[PDB]
Design a protein around this ligand. Sequence first.
Ligand SMILES: *[C@@H]1O[C@H](CO)[C@@H](O[C@@H]2O[C@H](CO)[C@@H](O[C@@H]3O[C@H](CO)[C@@H](O)[C@H](O)[C@@H]3O)[C@H](O)[C@H]2NC(C)=O)[C@H](O)[C@H]1NC(C)=O
Ligand SMILES: *[C@@H]1O[C@H](CO)[C@@H](O[C@@H]2O[C@H](CO)[C@@H](O[C@@H]3O[C@H](CO)[C@@H](O)[C@H](O)[C@@H]3O)[C@H](O)[C@H]2NC(C)=O)[C@H](O)[C@H]1NC(C)=O
Lengths: 262, 52, 49, 49, 52
Amino acid sequence: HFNVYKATRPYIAYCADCGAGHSCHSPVAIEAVRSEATDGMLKIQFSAQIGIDKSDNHDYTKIRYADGHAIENAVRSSLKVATSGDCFVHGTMGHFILAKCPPGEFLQVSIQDTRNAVRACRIQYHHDPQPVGREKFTIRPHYGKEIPCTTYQQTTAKTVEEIDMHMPPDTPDRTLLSQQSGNVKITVGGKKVKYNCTCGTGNVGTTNSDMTINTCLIEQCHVSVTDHKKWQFNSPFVPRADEPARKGKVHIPFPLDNITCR
Amino acid sequence: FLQVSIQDTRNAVRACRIQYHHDPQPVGREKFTIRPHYGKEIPCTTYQQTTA
Amino acid sequence: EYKTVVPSPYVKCCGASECSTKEKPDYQCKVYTGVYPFMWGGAYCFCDS
Amino acid sequence: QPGRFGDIQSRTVESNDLYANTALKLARPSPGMVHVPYTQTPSGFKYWL
Amino acid sequence: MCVLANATFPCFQPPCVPCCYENNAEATLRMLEDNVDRPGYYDLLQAALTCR
Ligand SMILES: *[C@@H]1O[C@H](CO)[C@@H](O[C@@H]2O[C@H](CO)[C@@H](O[C@@H]3O[C@H](CO)[C@@H](O)[C@H](O)[C@@H]3O)[C@H](O)[C@H]2NC(C)=O)[C@H](O)[C@H]1NC(C)=O
Ligand SMILES: *[C@@H]1O[C@H](CO)[C@@H](O[C@@H]2O[C@H](CO)[C@@H](O[C@@H]3O[C@H](CO)[C@@H](O)[C@H](O)[C@@H]3O)[C@H](O)[C@H]2NC(C)=O)[C@H](O)[C@H]1NC(C)=O
């Protein structure tokens, strides 16, 4: 069948703090948290999509994540969603993660990197559920009534849902410029880098292989990998590539259905 | 309360815990929990990592 | 309830962009000048101001 | 009126039109970031609930 | 009901069958990016990214 998760890639965004009180661009950035489930089960959204390996194959063990315009994978274990206590994880697909948490004031999501370092993103969120009915209990009893309620299902069929993708911007970098002696070289590897220099009318355009200027210093040329080839996301934290925009459409998993609670 | 714990040579936990009523308030006029991504900068004091 | 839709900002550098109106509920748009964006690798749009 | 019942209104569940009045306001982004700050009065439906 | 420049082909049978993404991925994304307003978008997307 269709494998819509081939034209999407993980990205790196800006997190408010990384679990220690300082802000840096993390691969586990937290987007909006939706909690319209009656029994109280949250749909958190990463920036780095999950359940798929680097090779675009459905794997219950490899999770994709971005690092320096390069996609790596980490083990599904160690994926920790935490609140005042320690939550429980139910579902896992795409960018979305289904969690159930004790009452608290903030939540963080953390994973292990390729070289085994904790990458964590934390966001303020006043989570405090009220079970459906007229009594404010905690856990279900072994003798009681049945009331209708709503929750998120594990099915991934047609859902009639929208999330918007667009082509990633021109990623800036400075490592790919190497100044040896009155000249610089541009690193390669498949990234059709766009370059702009000022020395001697400069050189404007995009290349595909190694290039040398022989004329000016580093502080006139710029490295902007175009990449293209793959929809990233419509996130507020990364710029666009054109004013009228292009926009795409992807179905999100985990729709809403009726069930019965005790 | 707060406790501190270290492993011994033989992987035996050694810990000690003391009664201490810890309840911070951030400086300002809101009692927020973690810093936002758009707001003011207010002076405050902290311990530095330098060992000079 | 409502859902606030915030499309990704468009940063045109070494130039300017002009705001336009659209027929959307409570639509809002603005332009800010003098920005110096930063990214993970380094601040793009070499034009200083 | 924003902040109370009926901040957004639709003639029908299936209707395409919408009238929302929620005082969505924009702010100038901080130096060295790309984040589109806004402020908005909380939803009226939650507070009526 | 979908259109490609001056093609006007049914969305159920795109002219790039089979393996549109494999043969030309960039063209596939650009072609899908002009049909967001068309009602027949989901069948086109199904046909674009489905080939054995
Ligand atoms: C959980 O169960 C409720 C109760 O059945 C479901 O709500 C029902 O959804 C159907 C849609 O298939 C509604 O039918 C509607 O009827 C109106 C005419 O009144 C028509 O204009 C609509 O096009 C649609 O056919 C039905 O009224 C509605 N029931 C109630 C009491 O509102 C709900 O969909 C179920 N699933 C959830 C909540 O996830
Ligand atoms: C590559 O970088 C250079 C700068 O390092 C870019 O040149 C810049 O071009 C824009 C418009 O083309 C200039 O903005 C305006 O230009 C008019 C021209 O008369 C000037 O009168 C205005 O006052 C305003 O400056 C900008 O000044 C200029 N920057 C310079 C000369 O340092 C160039 O556009 C870049 N290449 C590409 C493809 O964008």
